[PDB]
């Protein structure tokens, strides 16, 4: 018998643990280190174990 599910078509890993990759761009006119600081500031809300 058949049943429909909902799974991912691309599962990638990084150093032996699974992950998902982003492709970020800095703001127009701002430094790349400023964008790196402003994107490592966002990581202060991810669940315990990520």
């Amino acid at each position: 018998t058949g049943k429909w599910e909902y799974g991912s078509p691309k599962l990638e890993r990084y150093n032996g643990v699974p992950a998902m990759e982003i492709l970020g761009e800095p703001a127009p006119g701002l430094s790349s280190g400023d964008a790196m600081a402003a994107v490592e500031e966002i990581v202060k809300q991810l669940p315990k174990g990520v």
Binding site: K3, W4, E5, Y6
Partner: protein
Amino acid sequence: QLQEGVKQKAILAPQQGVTRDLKGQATALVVNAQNKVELRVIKADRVIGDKWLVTEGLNAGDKIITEGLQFVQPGVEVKTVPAKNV
């Protein structure tokens, strides 16, 4: 090739209107007379030719989304243009 019944006044939705979600059921984005997109629970199992032969949720007169299921989330006021693919 024995015939096993007709369904009088049936509904046929394409694959572009019927996509599925995390729970295992089927969804279909319809629009209203208020021109808002609405997600109702469609029930499709059989594929004839290509169109799904549905039994639940959709009646005659509804309009399902067939281009732009990525640009449009349920709750957005849209404008309607007829389709370019079958």
